[PDB]
Short mmCIF file of C-alpha atoms and ligand atoms in Angstrom, two decimals:
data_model
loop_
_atom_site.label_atom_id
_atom_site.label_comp_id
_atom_site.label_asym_id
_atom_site.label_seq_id
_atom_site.Cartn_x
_atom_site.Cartn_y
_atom_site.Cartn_z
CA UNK A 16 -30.64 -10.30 8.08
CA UNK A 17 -29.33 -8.36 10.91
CA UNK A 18 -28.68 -4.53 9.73
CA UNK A 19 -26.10 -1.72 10.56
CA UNK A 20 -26.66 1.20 12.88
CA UNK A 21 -25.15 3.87 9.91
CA UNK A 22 -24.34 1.71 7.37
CA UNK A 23 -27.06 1.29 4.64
CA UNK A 24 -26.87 -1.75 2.37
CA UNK A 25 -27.23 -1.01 -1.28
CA UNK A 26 -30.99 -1.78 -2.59
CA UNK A 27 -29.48 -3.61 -5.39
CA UNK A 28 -26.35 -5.76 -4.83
CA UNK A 29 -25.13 -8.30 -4.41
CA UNK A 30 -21.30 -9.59 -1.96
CA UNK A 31 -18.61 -11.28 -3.39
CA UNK A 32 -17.95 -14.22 -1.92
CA UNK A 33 -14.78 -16.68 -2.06
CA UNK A 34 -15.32 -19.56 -4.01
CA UNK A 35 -14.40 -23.21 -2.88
CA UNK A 36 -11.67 -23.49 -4.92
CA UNK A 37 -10.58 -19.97 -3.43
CA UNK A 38 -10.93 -17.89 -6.12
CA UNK A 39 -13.21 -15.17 -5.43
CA UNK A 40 -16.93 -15.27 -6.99
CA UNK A 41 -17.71 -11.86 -7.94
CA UNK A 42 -21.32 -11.22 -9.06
CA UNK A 43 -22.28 -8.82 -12.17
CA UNK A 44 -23.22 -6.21 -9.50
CA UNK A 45 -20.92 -6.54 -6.70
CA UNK A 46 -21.51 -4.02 -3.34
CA UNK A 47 -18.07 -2.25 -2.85
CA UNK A 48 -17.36 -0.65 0.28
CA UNK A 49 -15.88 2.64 0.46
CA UNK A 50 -14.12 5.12 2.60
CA UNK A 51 -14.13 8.52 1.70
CA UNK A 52 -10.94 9.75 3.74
CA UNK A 53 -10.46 12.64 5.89
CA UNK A 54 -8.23 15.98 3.97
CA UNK A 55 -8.20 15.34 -0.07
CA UNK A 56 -10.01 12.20 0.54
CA UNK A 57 -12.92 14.76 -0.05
CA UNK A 58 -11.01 15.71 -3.58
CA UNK A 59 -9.85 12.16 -4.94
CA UNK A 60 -12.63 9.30 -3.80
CA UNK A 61 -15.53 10.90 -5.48
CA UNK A 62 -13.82 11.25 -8.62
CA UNK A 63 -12.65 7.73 -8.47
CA UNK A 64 -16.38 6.55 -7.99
CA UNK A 65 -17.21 8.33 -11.20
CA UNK A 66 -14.03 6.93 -13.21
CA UNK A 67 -14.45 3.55 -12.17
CA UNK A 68 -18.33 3.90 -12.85
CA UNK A 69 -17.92 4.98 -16.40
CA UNK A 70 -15.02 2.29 -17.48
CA UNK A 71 -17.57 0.42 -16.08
CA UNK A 72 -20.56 1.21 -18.27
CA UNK A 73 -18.36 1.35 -21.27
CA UNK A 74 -16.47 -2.27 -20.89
CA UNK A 75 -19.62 -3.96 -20.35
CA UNK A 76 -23.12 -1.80 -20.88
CA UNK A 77 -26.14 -2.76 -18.68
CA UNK A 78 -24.18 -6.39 -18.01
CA UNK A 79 -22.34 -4.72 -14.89
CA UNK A 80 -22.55 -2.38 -12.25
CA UNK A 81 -20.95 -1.77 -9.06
CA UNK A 82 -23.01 -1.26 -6.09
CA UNK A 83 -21.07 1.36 -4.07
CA UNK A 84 -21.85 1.02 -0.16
CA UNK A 85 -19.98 3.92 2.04
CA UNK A 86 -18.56 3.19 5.63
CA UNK A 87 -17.12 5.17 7.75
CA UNK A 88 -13.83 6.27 9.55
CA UNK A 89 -11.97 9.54 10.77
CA UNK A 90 -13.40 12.93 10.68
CA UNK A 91 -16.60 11.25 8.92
CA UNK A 92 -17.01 8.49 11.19
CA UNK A 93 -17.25 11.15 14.43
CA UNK A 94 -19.66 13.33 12.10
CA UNK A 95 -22.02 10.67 11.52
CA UNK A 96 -21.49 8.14 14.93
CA UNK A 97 -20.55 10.95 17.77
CA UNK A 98 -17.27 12.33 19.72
CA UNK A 99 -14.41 9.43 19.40
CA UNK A 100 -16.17 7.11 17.12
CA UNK A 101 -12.75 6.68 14.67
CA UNK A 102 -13.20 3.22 13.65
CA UNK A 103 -17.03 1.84 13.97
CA UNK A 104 -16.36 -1.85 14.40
CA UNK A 105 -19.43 -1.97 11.74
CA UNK A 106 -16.44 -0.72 9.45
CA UNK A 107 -14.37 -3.08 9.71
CA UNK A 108 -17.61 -5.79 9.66
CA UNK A 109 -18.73 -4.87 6.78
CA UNK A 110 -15.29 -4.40 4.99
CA UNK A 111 -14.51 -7.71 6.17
CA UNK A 112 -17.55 -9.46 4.96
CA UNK A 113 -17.73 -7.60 1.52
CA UNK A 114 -14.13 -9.21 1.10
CA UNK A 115 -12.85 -5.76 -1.66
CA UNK A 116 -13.34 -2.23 -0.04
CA UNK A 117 -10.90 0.94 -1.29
CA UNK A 118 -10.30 3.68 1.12
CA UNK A 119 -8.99 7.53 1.12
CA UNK A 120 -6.29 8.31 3.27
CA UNK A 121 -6.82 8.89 6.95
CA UNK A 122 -5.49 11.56 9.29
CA UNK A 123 -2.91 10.43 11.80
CA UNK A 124 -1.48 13.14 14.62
CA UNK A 125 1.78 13.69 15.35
CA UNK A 126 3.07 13.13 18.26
CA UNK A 127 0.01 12.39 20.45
CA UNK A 128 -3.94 11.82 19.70
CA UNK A 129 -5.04 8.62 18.31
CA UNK A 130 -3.06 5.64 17.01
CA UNK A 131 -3.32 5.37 12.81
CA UNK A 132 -6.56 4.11 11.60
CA UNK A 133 -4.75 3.39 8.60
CA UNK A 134 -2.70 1.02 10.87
CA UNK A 135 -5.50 0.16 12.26
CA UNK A 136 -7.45 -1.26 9.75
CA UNK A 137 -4.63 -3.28 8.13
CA UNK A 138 -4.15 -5.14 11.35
CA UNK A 139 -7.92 -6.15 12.53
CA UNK A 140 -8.21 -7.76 9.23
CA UNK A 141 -4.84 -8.91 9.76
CA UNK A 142 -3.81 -7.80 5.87
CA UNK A 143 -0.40 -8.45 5.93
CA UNK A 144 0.77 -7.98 2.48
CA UNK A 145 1.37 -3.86 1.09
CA UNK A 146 1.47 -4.15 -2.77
CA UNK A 147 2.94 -1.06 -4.10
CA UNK A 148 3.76 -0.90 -7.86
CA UNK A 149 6.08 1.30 -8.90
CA UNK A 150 4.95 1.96 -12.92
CA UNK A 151 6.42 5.01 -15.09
CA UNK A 152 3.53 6.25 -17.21
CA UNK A 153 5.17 8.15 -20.57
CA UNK A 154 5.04 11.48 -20.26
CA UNK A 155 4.59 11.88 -16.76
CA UNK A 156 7.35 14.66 -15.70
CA UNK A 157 10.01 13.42 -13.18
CA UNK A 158 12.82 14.36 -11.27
CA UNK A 159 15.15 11.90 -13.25
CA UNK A 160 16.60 11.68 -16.93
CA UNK A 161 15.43 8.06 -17.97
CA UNK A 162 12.21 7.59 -15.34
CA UNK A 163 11.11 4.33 -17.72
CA UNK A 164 14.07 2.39 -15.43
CA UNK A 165 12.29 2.44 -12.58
CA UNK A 166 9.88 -0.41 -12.27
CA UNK A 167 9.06 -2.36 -9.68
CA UNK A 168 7.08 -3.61 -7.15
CA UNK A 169 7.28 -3.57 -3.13
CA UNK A 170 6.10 -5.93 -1.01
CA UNK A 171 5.74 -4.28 2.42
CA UNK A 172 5.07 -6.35 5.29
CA UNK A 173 2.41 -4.83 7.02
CA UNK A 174 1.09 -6.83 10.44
CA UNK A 175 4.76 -5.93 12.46
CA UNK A 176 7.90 -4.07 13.08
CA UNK A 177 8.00 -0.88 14.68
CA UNK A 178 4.57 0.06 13.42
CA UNK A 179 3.13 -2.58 16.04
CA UNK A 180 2.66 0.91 18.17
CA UNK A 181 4.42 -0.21 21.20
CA UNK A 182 5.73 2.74 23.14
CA UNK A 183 5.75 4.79 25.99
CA UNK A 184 5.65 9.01 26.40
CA UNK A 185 9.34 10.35 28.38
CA UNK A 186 8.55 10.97 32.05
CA UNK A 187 5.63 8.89 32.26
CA UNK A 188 5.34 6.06 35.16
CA UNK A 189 4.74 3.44 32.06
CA UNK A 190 8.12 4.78 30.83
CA UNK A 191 9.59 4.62 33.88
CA UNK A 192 8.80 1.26 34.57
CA UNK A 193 10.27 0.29 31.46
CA UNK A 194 13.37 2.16 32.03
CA UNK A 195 13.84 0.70 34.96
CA UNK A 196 12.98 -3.58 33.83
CA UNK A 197 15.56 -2.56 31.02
CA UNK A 198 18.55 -1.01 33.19
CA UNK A 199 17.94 -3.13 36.28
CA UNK A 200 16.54 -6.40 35.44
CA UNK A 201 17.75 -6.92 31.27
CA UNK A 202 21.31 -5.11 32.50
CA UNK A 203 21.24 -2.58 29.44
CA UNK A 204 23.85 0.06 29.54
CA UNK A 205 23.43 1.86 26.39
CA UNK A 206 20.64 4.24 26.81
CA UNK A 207 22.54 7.16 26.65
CA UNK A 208 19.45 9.69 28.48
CA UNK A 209 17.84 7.62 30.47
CA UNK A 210 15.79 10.25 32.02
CA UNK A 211 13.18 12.26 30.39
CA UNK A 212 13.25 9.82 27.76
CA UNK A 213 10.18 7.87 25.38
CA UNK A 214 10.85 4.54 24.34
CA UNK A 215 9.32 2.03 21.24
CA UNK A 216 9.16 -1.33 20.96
CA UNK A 217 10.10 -3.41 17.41
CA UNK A 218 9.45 -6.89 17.54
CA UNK A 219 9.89 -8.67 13.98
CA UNK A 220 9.01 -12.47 13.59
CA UNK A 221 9.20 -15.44 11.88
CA UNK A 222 6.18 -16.17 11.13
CA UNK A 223 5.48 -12.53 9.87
CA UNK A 224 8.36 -12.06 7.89
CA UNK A 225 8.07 -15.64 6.04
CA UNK A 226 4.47 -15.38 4.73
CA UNK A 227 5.69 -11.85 3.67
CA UNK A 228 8.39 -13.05 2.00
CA UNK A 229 6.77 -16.00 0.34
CA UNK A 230 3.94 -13.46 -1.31
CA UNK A 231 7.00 -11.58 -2.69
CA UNK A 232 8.63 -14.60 -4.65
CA UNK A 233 4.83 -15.85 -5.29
CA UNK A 234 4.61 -12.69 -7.18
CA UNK A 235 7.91 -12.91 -8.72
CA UNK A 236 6.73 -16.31 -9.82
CA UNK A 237 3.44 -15.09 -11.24
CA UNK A 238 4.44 -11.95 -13.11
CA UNK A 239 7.61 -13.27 -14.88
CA UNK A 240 10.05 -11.48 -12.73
CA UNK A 241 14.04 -11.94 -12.42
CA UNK A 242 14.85 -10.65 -9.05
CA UNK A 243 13.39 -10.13 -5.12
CA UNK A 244 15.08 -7.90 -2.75
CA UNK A 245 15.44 -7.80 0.70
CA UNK A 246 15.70 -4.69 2.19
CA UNK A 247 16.90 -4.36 5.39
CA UNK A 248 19.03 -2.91 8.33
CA UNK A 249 20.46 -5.81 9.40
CA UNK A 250 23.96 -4.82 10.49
CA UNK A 251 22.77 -2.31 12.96
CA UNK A 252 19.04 -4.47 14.21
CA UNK A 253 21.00 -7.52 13.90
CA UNK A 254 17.65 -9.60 15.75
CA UNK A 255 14.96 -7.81 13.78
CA UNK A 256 16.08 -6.62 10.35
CA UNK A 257 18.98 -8.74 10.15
CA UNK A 258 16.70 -11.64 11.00
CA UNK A 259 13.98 -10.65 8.45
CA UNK A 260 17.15 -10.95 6.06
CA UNK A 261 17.94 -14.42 6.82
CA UNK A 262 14.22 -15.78 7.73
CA UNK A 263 13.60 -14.63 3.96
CA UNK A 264 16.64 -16.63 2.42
CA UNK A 265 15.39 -19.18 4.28
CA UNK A 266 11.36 -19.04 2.45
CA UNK A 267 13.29 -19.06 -0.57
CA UNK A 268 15.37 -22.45 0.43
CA UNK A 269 12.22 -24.00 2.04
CA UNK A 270 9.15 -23.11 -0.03
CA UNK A 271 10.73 -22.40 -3.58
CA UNK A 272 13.49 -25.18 -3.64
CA UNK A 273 16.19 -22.20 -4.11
CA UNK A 274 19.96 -22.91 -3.77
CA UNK A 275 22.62 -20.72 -2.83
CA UNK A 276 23.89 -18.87 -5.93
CA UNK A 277 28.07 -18.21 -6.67
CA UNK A 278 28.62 -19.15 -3.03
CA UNK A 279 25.99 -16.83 -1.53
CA UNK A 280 24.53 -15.05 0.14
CA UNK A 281 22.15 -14.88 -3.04
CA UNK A 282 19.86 -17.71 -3.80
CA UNK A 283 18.62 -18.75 -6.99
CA UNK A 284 15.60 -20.91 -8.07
CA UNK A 285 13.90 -22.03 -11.35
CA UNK A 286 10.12 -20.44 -11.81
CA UNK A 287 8.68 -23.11 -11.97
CA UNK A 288 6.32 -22.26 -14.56
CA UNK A 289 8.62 -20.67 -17.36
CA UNK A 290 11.79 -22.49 -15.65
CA UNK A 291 13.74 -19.05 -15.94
CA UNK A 292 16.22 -18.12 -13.21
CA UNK A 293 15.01 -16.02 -10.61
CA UNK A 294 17.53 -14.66 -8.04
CA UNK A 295 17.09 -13.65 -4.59
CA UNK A 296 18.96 -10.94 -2.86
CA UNK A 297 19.62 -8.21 -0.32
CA UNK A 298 20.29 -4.74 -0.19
CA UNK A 299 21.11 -2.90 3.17
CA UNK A 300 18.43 -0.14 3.61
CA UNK A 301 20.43 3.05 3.16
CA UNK A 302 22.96 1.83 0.71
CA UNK A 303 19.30 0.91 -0.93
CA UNK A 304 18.35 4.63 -1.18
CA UNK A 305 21.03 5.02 -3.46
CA UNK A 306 20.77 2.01 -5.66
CA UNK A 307 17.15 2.64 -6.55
CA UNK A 308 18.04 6.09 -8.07
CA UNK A 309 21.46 5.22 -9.59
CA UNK A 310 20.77 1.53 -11.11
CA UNK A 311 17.32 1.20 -10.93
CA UNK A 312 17.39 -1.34 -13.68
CA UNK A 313 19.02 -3.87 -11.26
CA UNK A 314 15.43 -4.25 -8.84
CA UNK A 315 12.72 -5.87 -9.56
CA UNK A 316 10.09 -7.30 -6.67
CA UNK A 317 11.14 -5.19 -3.08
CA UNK A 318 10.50 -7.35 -0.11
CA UNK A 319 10.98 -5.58 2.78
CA UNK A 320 9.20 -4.63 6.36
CA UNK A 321 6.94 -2.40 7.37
CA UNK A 322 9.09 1.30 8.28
CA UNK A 323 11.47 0.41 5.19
CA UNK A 324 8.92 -0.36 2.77
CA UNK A 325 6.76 3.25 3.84
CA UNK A 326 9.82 5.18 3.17
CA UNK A 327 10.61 3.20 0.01
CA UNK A 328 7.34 3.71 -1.31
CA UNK A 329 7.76 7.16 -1.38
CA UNK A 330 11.43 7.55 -2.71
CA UNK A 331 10.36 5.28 -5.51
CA UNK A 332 7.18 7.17 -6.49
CA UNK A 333 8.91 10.17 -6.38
CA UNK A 334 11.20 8.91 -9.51
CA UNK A 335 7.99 8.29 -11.60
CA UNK A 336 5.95 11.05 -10.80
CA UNK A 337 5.16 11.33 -7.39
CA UNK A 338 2.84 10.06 -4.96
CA UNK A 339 -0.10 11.69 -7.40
CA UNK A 340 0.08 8.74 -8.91
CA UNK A 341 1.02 5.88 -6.93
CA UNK A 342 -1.13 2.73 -6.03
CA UNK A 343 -1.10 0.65 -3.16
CA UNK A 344 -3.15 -2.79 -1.93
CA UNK A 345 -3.83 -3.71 1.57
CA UNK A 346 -4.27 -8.32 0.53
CA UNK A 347 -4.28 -11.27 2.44
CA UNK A 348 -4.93 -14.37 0.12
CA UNK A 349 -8.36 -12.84 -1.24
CA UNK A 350 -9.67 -9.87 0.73
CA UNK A 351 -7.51 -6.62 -0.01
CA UNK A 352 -8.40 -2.88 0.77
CA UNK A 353 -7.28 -1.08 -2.39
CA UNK A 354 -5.18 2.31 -1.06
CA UNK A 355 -3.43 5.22 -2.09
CA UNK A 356 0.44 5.21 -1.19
CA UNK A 357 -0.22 9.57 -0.30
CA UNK A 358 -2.05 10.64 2.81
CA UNK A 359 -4.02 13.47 3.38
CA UNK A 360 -2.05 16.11 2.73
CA UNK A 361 -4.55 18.90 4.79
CA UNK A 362 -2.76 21.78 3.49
CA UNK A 363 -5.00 21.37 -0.02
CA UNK A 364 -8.38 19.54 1.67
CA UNK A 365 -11.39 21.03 -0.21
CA UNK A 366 -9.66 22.63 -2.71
CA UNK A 367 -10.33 20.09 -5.53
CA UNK A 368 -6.64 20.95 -6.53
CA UNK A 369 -4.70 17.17 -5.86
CA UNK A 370 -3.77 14.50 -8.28
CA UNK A 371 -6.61 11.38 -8.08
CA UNK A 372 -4.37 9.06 -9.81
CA UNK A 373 -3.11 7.36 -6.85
CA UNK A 374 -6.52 6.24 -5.68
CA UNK A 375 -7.95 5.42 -9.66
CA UNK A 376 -4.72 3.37 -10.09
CA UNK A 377 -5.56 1.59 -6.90
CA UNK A 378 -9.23 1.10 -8.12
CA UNK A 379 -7.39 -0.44 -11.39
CA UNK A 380 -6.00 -2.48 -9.27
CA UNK A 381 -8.99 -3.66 -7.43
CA UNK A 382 -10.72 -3.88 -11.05
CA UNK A 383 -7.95 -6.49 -11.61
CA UNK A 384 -8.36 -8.09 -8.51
CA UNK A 385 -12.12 -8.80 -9.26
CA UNK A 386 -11.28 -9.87 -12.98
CA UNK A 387 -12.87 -7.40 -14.50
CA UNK A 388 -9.94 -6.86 -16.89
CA UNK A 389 -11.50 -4.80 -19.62
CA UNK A 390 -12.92 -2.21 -17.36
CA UNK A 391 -9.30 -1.61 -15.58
CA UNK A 392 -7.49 -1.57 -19.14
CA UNK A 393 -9.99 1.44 -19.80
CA UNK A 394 -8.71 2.94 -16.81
CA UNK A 395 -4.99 3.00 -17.57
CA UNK A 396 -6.25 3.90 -21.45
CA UNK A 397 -8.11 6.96 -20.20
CA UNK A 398 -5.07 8.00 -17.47
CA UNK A 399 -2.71 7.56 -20.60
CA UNK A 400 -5.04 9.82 -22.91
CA UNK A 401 -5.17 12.74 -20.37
CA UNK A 402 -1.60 12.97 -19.56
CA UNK A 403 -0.73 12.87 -23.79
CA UNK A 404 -3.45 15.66 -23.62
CA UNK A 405 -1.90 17.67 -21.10
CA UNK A 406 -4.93 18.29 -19.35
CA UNK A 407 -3.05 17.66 -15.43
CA UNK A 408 -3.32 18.55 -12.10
CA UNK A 409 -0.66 20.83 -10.08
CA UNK A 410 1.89 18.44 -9.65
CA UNK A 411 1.81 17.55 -12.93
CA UNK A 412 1.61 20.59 -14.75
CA UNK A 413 4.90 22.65 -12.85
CA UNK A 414 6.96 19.66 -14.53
CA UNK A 415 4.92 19.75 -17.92
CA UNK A 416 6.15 22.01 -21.15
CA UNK A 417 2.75 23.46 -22.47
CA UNK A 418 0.28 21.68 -20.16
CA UNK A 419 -3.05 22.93 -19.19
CA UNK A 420 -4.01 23.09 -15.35
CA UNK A 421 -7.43 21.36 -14.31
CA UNK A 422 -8.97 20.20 -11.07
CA UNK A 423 -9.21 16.60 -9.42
CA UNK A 424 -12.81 16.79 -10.56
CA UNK A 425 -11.07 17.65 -14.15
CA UNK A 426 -8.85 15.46 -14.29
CA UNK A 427 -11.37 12.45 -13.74
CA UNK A 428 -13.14 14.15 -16.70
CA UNK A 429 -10.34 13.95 -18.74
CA UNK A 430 -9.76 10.58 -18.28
CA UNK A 431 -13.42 9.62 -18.95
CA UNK A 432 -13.21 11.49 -22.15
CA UNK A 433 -10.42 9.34 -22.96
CA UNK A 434 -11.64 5.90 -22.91
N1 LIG B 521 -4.16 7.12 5.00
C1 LIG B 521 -2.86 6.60 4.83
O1 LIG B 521 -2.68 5.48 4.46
C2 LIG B 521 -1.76 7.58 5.20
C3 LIG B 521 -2.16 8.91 5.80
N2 LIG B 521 -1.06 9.69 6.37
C4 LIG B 521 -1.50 10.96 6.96
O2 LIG B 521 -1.56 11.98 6.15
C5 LIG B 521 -1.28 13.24 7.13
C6 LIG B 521 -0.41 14.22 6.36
O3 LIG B 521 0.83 13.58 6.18
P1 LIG B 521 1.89 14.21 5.10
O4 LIG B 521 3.29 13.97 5.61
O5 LIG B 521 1.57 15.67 4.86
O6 LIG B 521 1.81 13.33 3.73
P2 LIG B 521 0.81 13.46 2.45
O7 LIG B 521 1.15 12.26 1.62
O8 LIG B 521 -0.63 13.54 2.86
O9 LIG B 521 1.24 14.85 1.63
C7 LIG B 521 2.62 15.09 1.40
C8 LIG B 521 2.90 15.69 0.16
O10 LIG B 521 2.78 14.70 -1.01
C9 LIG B 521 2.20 15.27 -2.01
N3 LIG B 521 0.92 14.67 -2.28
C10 LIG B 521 0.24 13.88 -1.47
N4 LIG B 521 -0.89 13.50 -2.06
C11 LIG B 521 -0.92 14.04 -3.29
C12 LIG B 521 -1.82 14.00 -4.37
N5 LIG B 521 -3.04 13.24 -4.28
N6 LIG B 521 -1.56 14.71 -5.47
C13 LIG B 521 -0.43 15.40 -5.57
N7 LIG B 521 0.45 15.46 -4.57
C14 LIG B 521 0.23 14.78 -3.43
C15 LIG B 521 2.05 16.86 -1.59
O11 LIG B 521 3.35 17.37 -2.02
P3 LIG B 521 3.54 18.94 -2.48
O12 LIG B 521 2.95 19.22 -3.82
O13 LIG B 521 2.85 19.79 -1.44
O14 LIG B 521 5.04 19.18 -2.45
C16 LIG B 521 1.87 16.78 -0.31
O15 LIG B 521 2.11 18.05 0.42
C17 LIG B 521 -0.68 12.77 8.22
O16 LIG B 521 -1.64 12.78 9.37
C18 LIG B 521 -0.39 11.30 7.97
O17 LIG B 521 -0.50 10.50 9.09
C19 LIG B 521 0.11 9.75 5.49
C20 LIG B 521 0.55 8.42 4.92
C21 LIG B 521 -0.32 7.22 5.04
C22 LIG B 521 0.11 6.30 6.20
C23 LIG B 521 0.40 7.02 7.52
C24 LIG B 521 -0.72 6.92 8.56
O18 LIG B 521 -1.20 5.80 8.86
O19 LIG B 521 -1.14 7.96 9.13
C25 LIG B 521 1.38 5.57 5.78
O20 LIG B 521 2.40 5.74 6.36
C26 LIG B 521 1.36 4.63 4.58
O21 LIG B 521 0.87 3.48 4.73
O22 LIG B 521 1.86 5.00 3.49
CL1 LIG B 522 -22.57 11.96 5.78
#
């Protein structure tokens, strides 16, 4: 019964819900929470709304209708609660009760000021799994001769690693203490500057890494694909990367009944539901950076942790168009915040000049991940209409022969028009 202090539940609506069986129940007008996102979040979510709205209407008439119900972090969340009021925890309540949410991108400082809200939210609701598909849309322009190569999909752990935000600023006494437990108490030698010097923290786990991992080859399994990947630093962070390395063969061994294939280190299993071979492998990181680009027909499903699979996200994107139109998915088992890869990018805030795409593929995604299937194949139908049209934002049209420039707004338009 009990209501929010900003939030304002929609008049008509209704929550999805997770079913017994664990499936999720999702009601012919299901309340979606949204946030808008500080910078182009201004430009991209509203346009998303309206895209997702009318595939919508079309797929299924008066049957269905999505309840949108905003909530609020970043710049928006200080407008509307007062001074310091980043992350409501009636954000993250509501998010977490309404089980699907999509959000903008939030603004993160460098080098001081507040700890990522992005971050943030992944970890209260403890959404562990990254899903980042990595899809070449014809005609898109790109950077590389044959973009159609590159497909794949990253699983990027998201609850650890260095991203756990465990440091301390140079010169500080917290630094100083640290310094001083690690030179005097631990007996480390190798901190070259030892003075005037910030220090991080990386801790990487077992249990983190191997429900990670097993999503990765659960996908593999589900989506009929050949390969997973670990990515990883391991020579160099023998205890963390390295160990993500080996605590993933191991998921493989335990959970999927893999063996060690030609001797190893790869390991191979059956999928269990088509009985083709799938193999499991690993890549070291920077090596990596090279493989994707020159044989990108060797990867398939990327299972890696949470700095590798940030920087990943991006090198891979860039191949197939750019982070203009790349989707992302914050999951564990059932509740998932639906997010584009891109951030901000303040430099173009207001202008109504970015790509949506990344944010409408991610609400494609969360289409999917309600079962409404017909609405998200009109999404990809109208995204595949506008860019045969032409009709493109900036990023698009420098790479396109002949294309015409329009506006996020325009673009959404476009895509509408095309369903
Ligand atoms: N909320 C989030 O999840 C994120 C927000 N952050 C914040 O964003 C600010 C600015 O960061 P920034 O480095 O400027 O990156 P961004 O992506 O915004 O823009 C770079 C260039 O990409 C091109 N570009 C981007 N978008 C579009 C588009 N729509 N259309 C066309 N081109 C686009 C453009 O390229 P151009 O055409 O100009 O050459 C642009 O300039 C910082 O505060 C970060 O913290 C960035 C990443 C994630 C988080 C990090 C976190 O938690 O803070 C993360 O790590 C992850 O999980 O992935
Ligand atoms: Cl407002």
């Amino acid at each position: 019964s009990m209501t929010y202090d900003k939030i304002k539940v929609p008049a008509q609506g209704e929550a999805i819900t997770v079913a017994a069986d664990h499936s999720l129940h999702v009601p012919d007008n299901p309340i979606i929470p949204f946030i808008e996102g500080d910078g182009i979040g201004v430009d991209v979510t509203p346009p998303m709304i309206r895209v997702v709205d009318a595939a919508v209407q079309k797929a299924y008439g008066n049957k269905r209708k999505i309840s949108w119900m905003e909530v609020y972090a970043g710049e928006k969340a200080t407008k509307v609660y007062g001074g310091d009021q980043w992350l409501p925890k009636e954000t993250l309540d509501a998010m977490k009760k309404y089980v699907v949410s999509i959000k903008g991108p939030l603004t993160t400082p460098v080098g001081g000021g507040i700890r990522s809200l992005n971050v943030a939210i992944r970890q209260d609701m403890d959404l562990y799994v990254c899903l980042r598909p990595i899809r070449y849309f014809n005609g898109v322009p790109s950077p590389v001769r044959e973009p159609w190569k590159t497909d794949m999909v990253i699983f990027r752990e998201n609850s650890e690693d260095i991203y756990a935000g465990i440091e301390w600023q140079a010169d500080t006494p917290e630094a100083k203490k640290v310094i001083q437990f690690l030179t005097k108490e631990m007996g480390v030698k190798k901190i070259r500057f030892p003075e005037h010097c910030g220090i991080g923290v990386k801790p990487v786990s077992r249990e983190g890494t191997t429900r990670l991992v097993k999503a990765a080859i659960q996908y593999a399994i589900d989506n009929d694909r050949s390969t997973v990947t670990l990515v990883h630093k391991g020579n160099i962070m023998k205890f963390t990367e390295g160990a993500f390395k080996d605590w993933g063969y191991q998921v493989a061994r335990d959970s999927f009944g893999a063996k060690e294939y030609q001797g190893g280190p790869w390991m191979e299993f059956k999928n269990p539901k088509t009985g083709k071979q799938i193999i499991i492998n690993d890549v070291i990181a920077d090596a990596f950076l090279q493989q994707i680009l020159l044989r990108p027909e060797d990867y398939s499903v990327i299972a890696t942790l949470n700095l590798n699979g940030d920087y990943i996200s991006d090198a891979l994107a860039a191949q197939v168009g750019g982070i203009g139109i790349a989707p992302g998915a914050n999951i564990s088992d059932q509740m998932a915040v639906f997010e584009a890869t891109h951030g901000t990018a303040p430099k173009y805030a207001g202008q109504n000049k970015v790509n949506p795409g990344s944010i409408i593929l991610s609400a494609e995604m969360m289409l999917r991940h309600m079962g409404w299937y017909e609405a998200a194949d009109l999404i990809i139908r109208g995204m595949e209409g506008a860019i045969e049209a032409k009709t493109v934002t900036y990023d698009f049209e420098r790479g396109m022969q002949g294309a015409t420039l329009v506006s996020s707004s325009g673009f959404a338009d476009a895509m509408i028009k095309h369903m």
